[PDB]
Design a protein around this nucleic acid. Sequence first.
RNA 1: UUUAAUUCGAAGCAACGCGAAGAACCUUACCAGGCCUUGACAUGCUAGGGAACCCGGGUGAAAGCCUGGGGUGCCCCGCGAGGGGAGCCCUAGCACAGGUGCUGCAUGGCCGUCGUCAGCUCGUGCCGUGAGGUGUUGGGUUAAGUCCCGCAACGAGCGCAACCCCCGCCGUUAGUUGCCAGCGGUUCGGCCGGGCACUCUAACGGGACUGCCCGCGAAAGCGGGAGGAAGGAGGGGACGACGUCUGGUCAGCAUGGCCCUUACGGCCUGGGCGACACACGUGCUACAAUGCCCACUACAAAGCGAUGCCACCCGGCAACGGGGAGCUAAUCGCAAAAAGGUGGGCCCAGUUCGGAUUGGGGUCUGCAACCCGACCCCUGAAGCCGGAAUCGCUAGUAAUCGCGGAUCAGCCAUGCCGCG
Lengths: 127, 60, 206, 62, 98, 24, 155, 78
Amino acid sequence: EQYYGTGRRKEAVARVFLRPGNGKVTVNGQDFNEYFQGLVRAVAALEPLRAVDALGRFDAYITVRGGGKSGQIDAIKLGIARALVQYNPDYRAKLKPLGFLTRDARVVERKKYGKHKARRAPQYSKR
Amino acid sequence: ARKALIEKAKRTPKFKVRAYTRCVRCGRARSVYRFFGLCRICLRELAHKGQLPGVRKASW
Amino acid sequence: GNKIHPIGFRLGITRDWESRWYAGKKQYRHLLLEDQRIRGLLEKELYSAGLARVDIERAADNVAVTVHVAKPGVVIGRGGERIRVLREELAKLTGKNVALNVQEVQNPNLSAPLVAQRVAEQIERRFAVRRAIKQAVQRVMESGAKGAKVIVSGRIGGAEQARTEWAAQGRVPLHTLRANIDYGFALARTTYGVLGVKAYIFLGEV
Amino acid sequence: WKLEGELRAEVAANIKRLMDIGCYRGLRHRRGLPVRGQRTRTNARTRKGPRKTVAGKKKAPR
Amino acid sequence: KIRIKLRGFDHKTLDASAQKIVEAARRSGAQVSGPIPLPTRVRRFTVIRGPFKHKDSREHFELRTHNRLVDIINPNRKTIEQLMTLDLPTGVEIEIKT
Amino acid sequence: GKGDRRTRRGKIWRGTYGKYRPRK
Amino acid sequence: ARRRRAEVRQLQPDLVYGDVLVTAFINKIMRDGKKNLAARIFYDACKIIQEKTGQEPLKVFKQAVENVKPRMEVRSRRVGGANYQVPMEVSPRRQQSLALRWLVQAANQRPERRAAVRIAHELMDAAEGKGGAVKKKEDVERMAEANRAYAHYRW
Amino acid sequence: SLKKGVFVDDHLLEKVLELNAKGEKRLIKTWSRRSTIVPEMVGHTIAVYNGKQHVPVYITENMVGHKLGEFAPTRTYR
RNA sequence: UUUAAUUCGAAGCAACGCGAAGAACCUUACCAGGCCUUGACAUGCUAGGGAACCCGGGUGAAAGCCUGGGGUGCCCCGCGAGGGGAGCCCUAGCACAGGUGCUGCAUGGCCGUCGUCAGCUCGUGCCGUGAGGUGUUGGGUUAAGUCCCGCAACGAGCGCAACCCCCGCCGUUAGUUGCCAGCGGUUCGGCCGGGCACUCUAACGGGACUGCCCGCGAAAGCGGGAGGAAGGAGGGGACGACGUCUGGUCAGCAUGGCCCUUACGGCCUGGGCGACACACGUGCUACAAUGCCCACUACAAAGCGAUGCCACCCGGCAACGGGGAGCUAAUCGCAAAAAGGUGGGCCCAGUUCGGAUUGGGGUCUGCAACCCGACCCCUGAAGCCGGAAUCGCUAGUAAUCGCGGAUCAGCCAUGCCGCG
Ligand SMILES: [Mg+2]
Ligand SMILES: [Mg+2]
Ligand SMILES: [Mg+2]
Ligand SMILES: [Mg+2]
Ligand SMILES: [Mg+2]
Ligand SMILES: [Mg+2]
Ligand SMILES: [Mg+2]
Ligand SMILES: [Mg+2]
Ligand SMILES: [Mg+2]
Ligand SMILES: [Mg+2]
Ligand SMILES: [Mg+2]
Ligand SMILES: [Mg+2]
């Protein structure tokens, strides 16, 4: 019935549940394109469904928390791949050639004293 | 003006405003953290000895 | 300007607090202040006793002070009259009731604070520094240290030009965080001002 | 409400009125500088024109 | 039904108390909601290393107040008996609600 | 912009509320 | 830098046409990480290529890029007193990068007021062998050649 | 600007107001720059300290909302 | 430069949003003026009084000077007269205190800096009359004196790295204040039953090692590949060798020496550190259409708070004010995140760009906002992208967008340290 992947990216966490069906997709109880409305990049979320043909063959109940939409989009891209590799282990030999099962460790780097913001150094003068 | 200024800081006077933080070992009047009652020098000096309970070099 | 406090650098790991109580924002201020008037008083009165630490625990708002001395004889008294007044002194200056326990520092030659104090005391009494230093380090190592360092600051022998005579034996891996390097620091007050003394004793790993 | 000219009028009057027995604020206006407590050591270029570069200074020779 | 809240700076000796105040409470025959780790509040102190002049270079300290929650969900007199008498606190603060 | 108090952004910026950034 | 050749960043393909070359260009349109605006600007602009021709924007896009790539550039090299602008080849990679940047840089010199129109027309003009991007590129081969005399320092 | 009270100091207010039990001289040294000028105190020459000296300010109805300091520059030539 | 004073220090990098993580009074070290002297503070000795404490009266700007009252618990001779008495407090005398007065080449401590650069040494041997050399010159390799090979050296130490924290994958423990997948119910917001699965929280663990495969190489290593959340130091911290700089700090503290003693000490009121013809550093806001305004609608993290965060009403255009829950806070609050998205307005204009300056009328803190506070509400400067020059950054970096904190009554924070 219900397949699961946890998706995380950059302080975003995506609880992702996959069922079979017509093709519908909900994020925090909203339609996917109402939630991610106007964000050119949103579609990237489902890119792991297209990688196994199986787009419309699934319905997905997604909850998402923390971060911003684009992290959430990425987190969802990971949940969705984790979820479906869950219910068919072979969806992995063709899903790992793309990055879909990687987490993406890239995170805001820490502000450091003496710098203005991690690397950006104060302007230096001499004269 | 120092010994008598660490003293006049303890007496509490006309107008509540005139009172000020003032470090508890150093008489220092600047950079005293109200949690510890200590100057930022004082706090470092003690912190390193393990005499501020709980207090540790932070790193993240 | 460098080398951080080998104690401060350890704390969670390898080496423990000298005061372990809890207090919230409203309280810490006042208990810390006490701690300090406590340590301060014991720091001068128990000089002759060679005190290394003054650990301070605190529970049901009641205060136990362990004084880790080399010479409990001196803190105690004949049949304990001195420690009497000491328990009463603390009580005078704290509005409270304070346990004051002694604890013999088993080997004083592995107590960095003491080694340091001893060299400082030696200097205060016009002893040759280089030799005093070198000997302190022999004592430490003889007492089974894996390594030891001692450093006298400047105005050695009374000079105009301040200096810094160091001297060391064994390992003193200051960057190594599992090490357990006791560290200690006493003054020499002299006719010619202050010299500071640092001792590092390295005792073992893990 | 009033309003162009019969407003200009009012403003000037206020300021000239501020010369009175001469408040600090009333100097300042006379003097060209800013009124409202501002730093004159570095800015105030709105209340003075652009920069009158009356200069001359370096260090000690021998 | 009894909430006992444990604060501490040392997380090793907080946990050691939580476990103790549970070990003994189950031994009074009370059911206990295992010691729950509540989030840590952290207090940074960021301080100039030098006494005088050196506004860049500086050292971060933190004072991590740990928190543990413990519910004993149906409590005996025998249960109140062990707690309001049989103690082990050094640098830990417990406080009791209902 | 951020220097105009009499707007949304110059209010946010200054850290305040009024006729041009009402408290919710 | 000094140790090694440095890895060239593989851009993620485009979400519409699936072209890595489109996200490059988008990344040049992008200002202050406002990538939505950027891609939103590039796609409007692709629709302007519809309204003003029954051609696919991708085809015409790819054609502008091909006409703004330079063949050779003067690259500054130093003798030790006076300096010579020396002519030499352009890398494949550098070409692409130059092409897209000029395109954008050129597009924003333009006098129309919306960006999407600016980018569309400048794309149209460049695929028709003559925008302001193409002058830049021309200027650059007319800077080589104007200096073909010094092509014997080819570094 | 205050708005409950007019924050004038009483040592000033009294030396002033007893003085209008039939009007007298004006050797009225004060230090309270702080103090607002009050209605009808027009006529009193007040000697307001400016850090150095007391500078006699002749008072008048056009200047009531103003503190006394306002008419005694603390700093000399600009 | 000026001033009565504009206290003091920092001076290429490594002084100049630096000490200062909060200058109206306080701070405060300076100026003026008014006041105090065994002193605001300490240790102790002599003495008549007083001996705790607490209240008003004059004179003052306040300090202060002068004043007049309420009124002795305590050790103890005692059943009391009366009388010893120790704390404690004022008067005078004696020792002494006080000094942010000088010296950072008299110092300690701490810091900067070369530089996280890859170095700096030692023990014994051997070479050299010797200073010294070898080791640590060479070849390869590495982020690295990292490793390999070689070699009159064989080892070792301080450094590198590792051991420590954060971030990334997973597991075990735990299930409230946190979560809500499947139920059941429902005043919709997990609100109630249930449940801890997932998310979290936070404590302990696992996991990466060039381990495996291919190629090159004598080796160390390198190129590539596979698996894996993650490789080739996974990304960030903490961490700074022997030493350098007669570096910085006597104004945090300590300290030798020098100096002040009805004053160079101490208290106050006011002024000043905020001055402005200039010059420089670091920043902020901009010059706009990839923009600006207004409405509506989202998606964070890390912090902070019970004389404090303040929900929610109401009044007020509004700052704020009246009410007034909740919250010892994974509970309640600060909290709106902004940029984004959706509507609409602007139409290239010194403008619906930009918000300086100035006038008024308000609010709040505080004894008090004149010098000198912030905030709210009704003039609209320069500026059309900046000369010579010059800075930052190699990836979740720069760029841009907001959020929080320390100090703090308030705030001149556009700074700082953090968070996304
Ligand atoms: Mg950022
Ligand atoms: Mg600098
Ligand atoms: Mg204050
Ligand atoms: Mg700075
Ligand atoms: Mg505007
Ligand atoms: Mg000085
Ligand atoms: Mg020096
Ligand atoms: Mg100097
Ligand atoms: Mg010097
Ligand atoms: Mg200043
Ligand atoms: Mg103009
Ligand atoms: Mg224009």
